[PDB]
Amino acid sequence: VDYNRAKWLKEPNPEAEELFRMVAEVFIYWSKSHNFKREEQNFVVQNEINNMSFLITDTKSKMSRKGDRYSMQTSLIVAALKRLLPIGLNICAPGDQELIALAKNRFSLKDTEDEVRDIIRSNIHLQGKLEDPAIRWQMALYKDLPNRTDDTSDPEKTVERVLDIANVLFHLEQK
Amino acid sequence: KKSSTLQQLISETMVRWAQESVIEDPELVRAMFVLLHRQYDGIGGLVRALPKTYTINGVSVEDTINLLAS
Amino acid sequence: LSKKAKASTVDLPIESVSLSLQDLIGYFHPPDEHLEHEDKQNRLRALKNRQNLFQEEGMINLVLECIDRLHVYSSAAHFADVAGREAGESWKSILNSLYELLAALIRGNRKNCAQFSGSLDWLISRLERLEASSGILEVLHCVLVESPEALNIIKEGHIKSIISLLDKHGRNHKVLDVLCSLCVCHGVAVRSNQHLICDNLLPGRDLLLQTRLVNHVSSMRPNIFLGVSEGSAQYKKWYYELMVDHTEPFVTAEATHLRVGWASTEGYSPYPGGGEEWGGNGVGDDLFSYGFDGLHLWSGCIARTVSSPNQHLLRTDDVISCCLDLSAPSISFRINGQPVQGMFENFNIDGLFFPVVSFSAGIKVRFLLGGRHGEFKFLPPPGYAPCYEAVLPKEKLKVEHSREYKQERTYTRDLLGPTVSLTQAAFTPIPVDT
Amino acid sequence: GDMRVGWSRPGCQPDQELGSDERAFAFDGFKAQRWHQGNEHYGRSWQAGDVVGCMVDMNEHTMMFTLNGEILLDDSGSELAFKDFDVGDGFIPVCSLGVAQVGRMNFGKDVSTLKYFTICGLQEGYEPFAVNTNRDITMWLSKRLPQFLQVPSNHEHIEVTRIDGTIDSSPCLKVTQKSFGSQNSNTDIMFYRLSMPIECAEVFSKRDDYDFLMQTSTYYYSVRIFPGQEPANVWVGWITSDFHQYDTGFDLDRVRTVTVTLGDEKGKVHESIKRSNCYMVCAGESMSPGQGRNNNGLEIGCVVDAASGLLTFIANGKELSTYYQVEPSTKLFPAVFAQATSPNVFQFELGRIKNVMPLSAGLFKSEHKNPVPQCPPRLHVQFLSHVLWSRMPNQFLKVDVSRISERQGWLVQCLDPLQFMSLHIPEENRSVDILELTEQEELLKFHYHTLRLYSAVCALGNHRVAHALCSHVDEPQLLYAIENKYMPGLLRAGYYDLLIDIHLSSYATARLMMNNEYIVPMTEETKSITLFPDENKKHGLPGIGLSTSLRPRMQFSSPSFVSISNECYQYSPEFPLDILKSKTIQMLTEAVKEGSLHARDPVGGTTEFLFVPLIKLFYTLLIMGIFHNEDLKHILQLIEPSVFKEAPKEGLLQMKLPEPVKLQMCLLLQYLCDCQVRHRIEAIVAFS
Amino acid sequence: GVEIETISPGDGRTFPKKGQTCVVHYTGMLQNGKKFDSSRDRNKPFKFRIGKQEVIKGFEEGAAQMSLGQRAKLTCTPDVAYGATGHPGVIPPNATLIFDVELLNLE
């Protein structure tokens, strides 16, 4: 992904979307499961894997004590999630990311699936005053070139994407 | 409908400003409300103006101009 | 302490006076603006009542007497030599607190300021003293703002003393504010004060900052560097020409700038030295450049008029021949083939020289460097060589900006750091010692 | 190569490495390092042609760097280059370039020009630094030529003590070395001077005696080199304002000099003028015969005869052989160049000797006949320093250079005019661009109060003072200050007020004072007036129409200073009203369009500074009645396009203005209502 | 008592005479180089009639001995310019004045 990331950014890929959806459940299960924490800790210490050695070998060609054996911050799963995060960010836009943001804050105040979904469904309707620049000149300047479009996404798939990117971001900011 | 008139435009604008923000300048508040009262009291404008209105013939124009200059 | 009775019998309450002055300043402190309107009005009413009571009891004269008795001494050390070290350590602070208390007593009180109008003359007499200038200025500002009688009392001598305070103490905007208060108070102008301040402050043009519109001036030079050293291989005598195709004498209200001559670098660095890089200055505006403008020889931002047959400012169809002789340092000019009865000489020769033209907007000029870079209109003087012969074999002759930054888009502008020294320009071969 | 890029605090020093202190956070790709208060390893090294994207989040207090789009990573897994910094005064883009290094900074005014913004930063909600701007961001770069500035009270090495003059002594300015005898002490030479110059006579004419002391134009000062300081490391004399030569190795044989030789038509050199910026002597050679070097502090006395432009020196009660002859009108600053070899280096002594006036007499015109030596607070010690910035101009001259042909040479052509307003400091004999007062604060405050004083002295119809002020602030200056977009807000407001007060205030006040009185002559023009323009009872545009009521006559005088008629000291000075009106209309249209989009860079720095002076000038012209017909239609459409339309654009009324702008708009609407009332009165008279 | 340097030569034959109105552009400068007056700043040619004491006398002789179309620098001593009184607010006492006068037209 680190090698071919620019190409998917230039040309959106349903396979990349599927991979992001895939690692979303991996990350949420990683956050939810508790015994899995000490279990991975034990597995790593039994393997004596440097973990960061893979990234060091990657950045070795480009020349790019307390935590020598292992570290919380450099987990492989969160590293993969943050490397695939630009795909999610390019799929999404701020125009639904504002309600995705108060979706994260609802998750922080412990709103579960049902109320999150219905609150999003209710508050999609909040339109602005008929100038509001960031949203309209972004989307209009982008799509007034008529031929290329992504509008073929369904509202239910949009809701599911809102939910999963929101939970990924919420877990990431928690940890 | 739209204001279409200076008086209506001013009457709308003063009220819109006053109800849009709490004006911190007493001078601004006084000017706004003076203007609004002028808009709603167009008769009083003529009541004030007419006593200070005077007409003259064409032969006294230059002398009146000189007197006004002095 | 005065009257030569200096002893331990003195009864100076230095600490008590300091504490009481601080307490009184706090007592007369004006209300804060962050307070609610009604509380602010109540505090203002209480402050005005306190000021009126103090004025009626005659506290202003007591403060003035204390200030005078403290001012009979000239310095903190002079005071300490009579009163003691402890009193000297606080003489300045007590004077400052007394002035602050006076200002707080009379601030915002028209009656108090009108009564102080009588003593206003005595206040200004000590404006020059450094230990009391700020306090006296604050008191004067308050009195002049509040009382027209103060303006009526103020005369020419006081205004001239204030302007002398500007002259001696530097640029202080509070003095300008005091002068503004002298000019206008309560919407009523004082013509006498306005005329006095104008006639005594403006014509000097030595205190207030002066403003003027200046034409932007740019410079052009060939990529040629001429230098003389010991054991160098460089020729010493050089010649070039500049001929003017068009010149508008006044594109704007300011005369068009057009100077031609030579300029030197600051010790082998390619960057011209001794002058700014943006605008306003041209050839001969520093001690690193030597210019001719048709009537004057320019150097060090100083112009000397020079005689020539039918002398005139540079105009259309004028050919200027510039000669640089580094053997015996000299720079000479010839206008339209006629010699110019003036010459630069005995200048610094540690550095690299180059032809240069400085100009404002409204010119068309042409460099003639000899050979295939501009045929000379006149035969160069014997010994002198054309400037195109100084091109290094690898490089190509080119006319470019003398400075690094020109008109260009900001995102495409090249920001340049310091440049390497052109030590290779002077070829001095040093063989290995044998 | 050796380049750094990042974010700097406003107080960052121009002569210190980026990140070598607390004032800047930088990335150095020469060694793949991060820089703030030290050095740590971060990221990789760029090659030639790379693009480094600098990213700041002042909400989360984070900093990031990207190389060709890819985010640079720390030695650990952290993407953040810096994590915990206070906001302070904010951050500005900054870069540092070493020897022979070339870089380009792109603030993203045109987002399409950014190379890797879309790859990283666009999706993370990062805004380009100049996205919401109308004009190019001004650039400030470290100055090359050192300038003389007053020694700071917090200087690391130099300390200046002011010693008052007693009965038995003279005023003294003592220079001491703070850090001597401790390491990192500056062994380099320092160049000190006095803040005020002695100016020679304009034309040269080819106890003590009081009459001679009053008639003389000779001034004196001295320098005491203390024991323990090597006299061979101290130079004493005078310098001009042109002196900028900061050299570690200084000697009298390498000062800038020239000789202008002027002769007759055929040889016959009739004059030779030797010009230089440094007229000084070395104390070591000044000693000359055998002394103990320490019996008393060396006292080198400098004597300047301004009436003849002659500079002489005294070693110890003994005239030195070295002397100088300066050109007329030269301004000479007392100067000492010293390489400190002791905690106590030297001291200026502003005394006097027999038959010579002190330095204060020539420095201050108020003390021109005061033999008593003085050291007023204006006179202070300045030192040559490199801690200064230069403002890169927003526009350069367009010069076209091209090789026409082999025969014709190289053509250089420049035709488009360009000007800047120059602020001249009189005592320092230097000039700056007035746009540098955006960063120079004390000068900005003093000049704003100077403009206020200019307004005050001519306030309320002082036509003589207004005419005099026209000599100091001419109308090209006024127009340039009105139109310039980079002017500081305070100066812009001051110059607008100055223009109004000098040229427009008198007649505007006269019309406002006659405003509420309607004297309508009974003429055919008066009789032709009707309440409504046509059969349809539709109000006409206020102000537009035929008005016959008597008005004060508008008259102006030419501010010439070569005439002696004096009859022009009535009436305000004349100003180009057509040009002023056109510029006002154009500037107001531009201001409306620019403030509609709520830019980050309004003219003057704030919306108040952008609109209040412009609207004040517009209202003053409207009161004067200069506007007519089409200009009135344009200004009314600017105020309110919908109501005043003649049979998404929003006028000033629907613009979300600040309170002062609202007050001025209230004044404008008041004037429009007054115009309507006047029209009604005239129509009533016509019917009557 | 005034004296003149040429800057741009004129026609050399046509000179101001008595009863004629000179139309000129000038730029008034103090001896230190500080500008105090300029007709080019006001974009209005200055018109004055010979021998009517309309302007300062040094400027008068300078313009009189200039020619048509000529540009010249005029140096004027205080005694012919303003004397010891000076011009209040503009010209300091005993100030020598330098002008850059171009004689545009003669009416």
Side-chain angles (χ1 to χ4, degrees), chain A residues 5 9-10 62-64 82-83 89-90 92, chain D residues 43-45 70-71 77 79 118-119 123-124:
Chain A
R5 185 177 64 246
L9 185 62
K10 300 289 95 175
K62 284 86 173 177
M63 183 278 288
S64 179
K82 73 179 181 180
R83 295 294 87 193
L89 265 67
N90 78 27
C92 303
Chain D
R44 65 176 83 72
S45 293
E70 292 84 4
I71 305 165
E79 315 193 322
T118 48
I119 294 91
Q123 299 304 110
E124 289 88 311

Side-chain angles (χ1 to χ4, degrees), chain C residues 81-342:
Chain C
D81 291 355
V82 177
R85 191 265 301 162
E86 58 272 16
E89 290 295 328
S90 54
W91 173 85
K92 177 71 170 65
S93 73
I94 291 185
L95 268 179
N96 281 131
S97 294
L98 277 163
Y99 274 116
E100 196 182 353
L101 175 61
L102 181 62
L105 271 167
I106 61 182
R107 176 176 291 116
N109 207 298
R110 184 181 176 91
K111 187 210 184 322
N112 291 15
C113 286
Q115 301 268 350
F116 203 78
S117 64
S119 298
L120 197 67
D121 162 78
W122 163 93
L123 185 72
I124 302 172
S125 88
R126 296 169 182 173
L127 183 61
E128 67 275 15
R129 294 182 182 178
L130 196 47
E131 68 267 14
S133 180
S134 177
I136 289 174
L137 200 64
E138 192 47 59
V139 174
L140 189 61
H141 189 43
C142 284
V143 173
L144 295 177
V145 163
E146 262 297 300
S147 178
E149 301 88 20
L151 297 186
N152 299 6
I153 292 281
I154 290 291
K155 300 297 182 183
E156 179 178 345
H158 307 130
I159 285 167
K160 290 175 82 145
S161 302
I162 296 166
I163 295 168
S164 75
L165 193 74
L166 290 173
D167 173 72
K168 299 182 192 298
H169 282 46
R171 285 172 212 103
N172 187 17
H173 68 278
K174 299 183 186 296
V175 188
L176 296 191
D177 292 5
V178 163
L179 290 171
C180 290
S181 310
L182 281 172
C183 282
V184 181
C185 180
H186 289 326
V188 178
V190 183
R191 298 298 196 203
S192 58
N193 290 1
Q194 282 173 337
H195 293 316
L196 284 174
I197 286 155
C198 181
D199 297 353
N200 282 287
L201 186 64
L202 298 192
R205 291 164 221 254
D206 58 300
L207 310 175
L208 309 172
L209 313 170
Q210 314 293 315
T211 56
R212 201 201 178 141
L213 278 185
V214 182
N215 289 337
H216 266 288
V217 170
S218 293
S219 294
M220 291 286 144
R221 65 164 174 191
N223 55 333
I224 294 302
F225 291 103
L226 308 173
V228 57
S229 178
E230 181 64 28
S232 66
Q234 297 154 127
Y235 201 48
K236 269 83 72 178
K237 318 179 53 161
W238 300 96
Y239 172 87
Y240 85 97
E241 279 177 1
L242 185 77
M243 161 199 71
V244 190
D245 294 324
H246 172 252
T247 289
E248 172 66 34
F250 287 90
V251 190
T252 74
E254 176 166 309
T256 301
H257 178 91
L258 183 54
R259 294 190 206 157
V260 61
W262 303 86
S264 68
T265 60
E266 191 176 1
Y268 286 74
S269 88
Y271 195 35
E276 312 104 301
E277 47 188 353
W278 306 139
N281 280 347
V283 183
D285 281 340
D286 51 353
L287 276 182
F288 290 76
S289 50
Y290 314 98
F292 179 59
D293 76 342
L295 301 151
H296 311 95
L297 294 176
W298 284 89
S299 195
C301 201
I302 302 192
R304 291 303 306 246
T305 184
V306 65
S307 176
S308 65
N310 273 279
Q311 59 187 359
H312 56 261
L313 204 75
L314 291 185
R315 57 163 189 240
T316 298
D317 286 347
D318 272 16
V319 185
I320 308 100
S321 297
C322 317
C323 308
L324 163 76
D325 174 30
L326 288 170
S327 67
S330 71
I331 285 165
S332 64
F333 302 91
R334 286 170 60 243
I335 175 65
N336 285 305
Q338 286 86 18
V340 182
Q341 325 290 345

